[PDB]
Amino acid sequence: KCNKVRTVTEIVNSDEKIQKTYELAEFDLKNLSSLESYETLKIKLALSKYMAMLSTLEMTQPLLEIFRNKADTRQIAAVVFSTLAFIHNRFHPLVTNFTNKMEFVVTETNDTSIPGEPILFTENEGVLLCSVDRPSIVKMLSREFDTEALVNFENDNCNVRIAKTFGADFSITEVEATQYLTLLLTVEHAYLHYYIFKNYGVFEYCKSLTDHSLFTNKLRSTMSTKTSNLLLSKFKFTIEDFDK
């Protein structure tokens, strides 16, 4: 489907004709470029907005310091609350509040720790309650988990890739800001199960926590193009190594 679009013209009275032909390969290219640049800009904007909102909240000390402390009862809960509200708005831009009952619990002990889902919920033991493993959460903030950028990519049809080579007080570090994306995505994941149980019963919620798999059924007629934070979808490891 190379589709050398083909064209002709003539003067009235058909004196004589002229012909030309042309190639979409530049046009589609440019469109893809513009599209991805645009959407990246949008996502960066969104993240900026979130960060600013957080900034509003009168923090006395840096985020990492907050989490490294454990005597607090306000700050961490408030942060969680704010993040949850933000996500709920990103799904329901006209909706603003959850009608009370939201309550949180600090957890401190390996002998209370739970694999995978670091943040957990009981939607109604009379009323909602939630629980958080601050100890574990802290651990991700080891900066050596972060380092300057590799630039790999694969499967390039030559200039399809190279073309881009011809296409043109909290004043604080990029990597520090990058820390946030962790809790962003974590809370996103958690909100998945939260929404599921909010819509349905407890036993399917348990099944989802056994496998975050059956979601692929129920999460339909649910995301009416309200895109979420999975742009670069090539999440994968080696697989054949599973060795049963």
Binding site: T40, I43, K44, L45, S48, A52, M53, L57, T73, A77, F81, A85, T96, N97, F98, N100, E103, F104, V105, T112, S113, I114, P115, G116, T122, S131, S136, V138, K139, M140, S142, E144, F145, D146, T147, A149, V151, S171, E174, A177, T178, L185, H189, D211, H212, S213, T216, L219, R220, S221, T222, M223, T225, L230, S233, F235, K236, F237, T238, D241
Partner: protein, 231 residues
Amino acid sequence: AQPSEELINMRRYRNAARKLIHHYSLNSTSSTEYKISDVVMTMIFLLRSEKYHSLFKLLETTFDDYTCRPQMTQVQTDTLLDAVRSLLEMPSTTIDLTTVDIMRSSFARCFNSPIMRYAKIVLLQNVALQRDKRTTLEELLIERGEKIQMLQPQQYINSGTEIPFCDDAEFLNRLLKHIDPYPLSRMYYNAANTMFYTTMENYAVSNCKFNIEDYNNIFKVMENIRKHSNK
């Protein structure tokens, strides 16, 4: 011995050794980590302070290759951990016995096979966990849920309802410009692997092998999104 040449540029060894340690222990950002000769130089660099020799001996015991776990000579073990912290120069980032044991398990496979092309393979499991009893997730689910229900909220954290916002648009733009240069895609790729490691970091205890297909489902979330876009 003549370390003026047999230890020429002690840094030459130290730096790579620290890099390797930060890789195998705990986690670090991806890198093309390998040099068997560098492992050798790690040992040689260790052979010049008792605050090395202790560790060196501990790890050398792995050449017996059996997964038996040595006794903690409590006092000396503690002082040794302190020495480790020092020699790793980290800002006291909760260096712990468990991470030391993890590194021990890493050496439990390091020397143990002469696979002289490419053991390009994750070996996620650790034998040296507190038991090989290897019970399943579900029992721990009940065990946790018990104490979870038993616990009482530390604070009565809700009253009424509100939302915060601000509209310092100029300020926002300022912020955005300051942020702009950063290579977003790579400078968030790290977080994925961070959380991934966090998974095992939690389940270092009576672990259950399966993770892979659930992660794959998390990733095919985007497939589900596209199908929604296709109804």
